[PDB]
Amino acid sequence: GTSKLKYVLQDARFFLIKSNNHENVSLAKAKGVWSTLPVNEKKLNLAFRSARSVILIFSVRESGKFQGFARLSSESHHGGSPIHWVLPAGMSAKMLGGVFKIDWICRRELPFTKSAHLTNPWNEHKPVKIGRDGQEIELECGTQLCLLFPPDESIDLYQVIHKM
Ligand SMILES: CNc1ncnc2ccsc12
DSSP states (O other): OEEEEEEETOOEEEEEEEESSSSHHHHHHOOEEEOOOOEEEHHHHHHHSSOOOOOEEEETTTSEEEEEEEOOOOOOOOOOOOOOOOOTTOOOOOTTBBBEEEEEEOOOEEEGGGGGOEEEEEGTEEEOOOTTTOOOOHHHHHHHHHHHHHOOTOOOOHHHHOOO
């Protein structure tokens, strides 16, 4: 069903994640972690304090798809086990040192062809598939893009609902 999903998405904030590789999204799906550059780290730390839910919607560059979406369950932290990211060119471990804990809500893919009717008022009304890493997605466009994903029946949102 979609009832607990809508409950999670109520008054949430949505951020677009553009990973440069599939490997790190894979790693993020396994370990429930994500790291971004300092500029977006600050943005997500600020958003986590400000909304009942901060939703990250993932898309690997040049895949033509979103790969799922997840909920921030913490602010970033530095000093844990060095998460073996496939560092992208121009990025160092120090830059990606801030680690957000996340609870996945859907690990299923959604092809861009299916979100062509959705545009983002915070990105000049461009199709929601278009945007840099960190682009915030406006409440209604974000909500509807999430509802477009196939249900991920392996996930039980009771766990995520209580942290709210
Ligand atoms: C784990 N962090 C990342 N992995 C792959 N691509 C990007 C782009 C900005 S952060 C990031």
